[PDB]
C-alpha cells in the first residue's frame, strides 16, 4: 500500500511529530531540566489578584 504514499515515511513522520510535541512539553515541564523547575529563588513572582 505504498502508492502514492510511502507508508513507512508517513508512520515515521507522524511519530516524529508526536515526539517533537513531547520534546516541547519536556523543555517546559521536565523534572531534571525544564524551565518551570529550574527557576531561581527571587525570580518567582506571584500575581497580586489572580488575573494576569
Amino acid at each position: 500500500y505504498s502508492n502514492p504514499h510511502d507508508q513507512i515515511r508517513e508512520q515515521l513522520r507522524l511519530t516524529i511529530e508526536i515526539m517533537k510535541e513531547r520534546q516541547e512539553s519536556e523543555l517546559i515541564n521536565s523534572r531534571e531540566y525544564g524551565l518551570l523547575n529550574n527557576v531561581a529563588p527571587g525570580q518567582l513572582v506571584h500575581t497580586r489578584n489572580g488575573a494576569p
Binding site: 500500500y1 505504498s2 502508492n3 502514492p4
Partner: protein
C-alpha cells in the same frame, strides 16, 4: 601389489551437486497466465 583405489580416492575432489528437490514441477499455469501489476495491492474489476 600397488596403491589401491580407496586410498587414492582420499586425494580426489568429489563433484558435488546442488541439493535435488524432487517436488519441483514445471508449474505450467504460472508460465501460461498473463500477469498484471497492481501498484497498491488493490485491483477493482468494474
Amino acid at each position: 601389489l600397488a596403491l589401491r583405489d580407496v586410498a587414492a580416492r582420499q586425494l580426489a575432489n568429489a563433484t558435488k551437486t546442488v541439493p535435488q528437490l524432487r517436488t519441483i514441477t514445471p508449474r505450467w499455469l504460472v508460465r501460461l497466465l498473463h500477469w498484471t501489476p497492481v501498484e497498491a495491492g488493490i485491483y477493482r474489476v468494474n
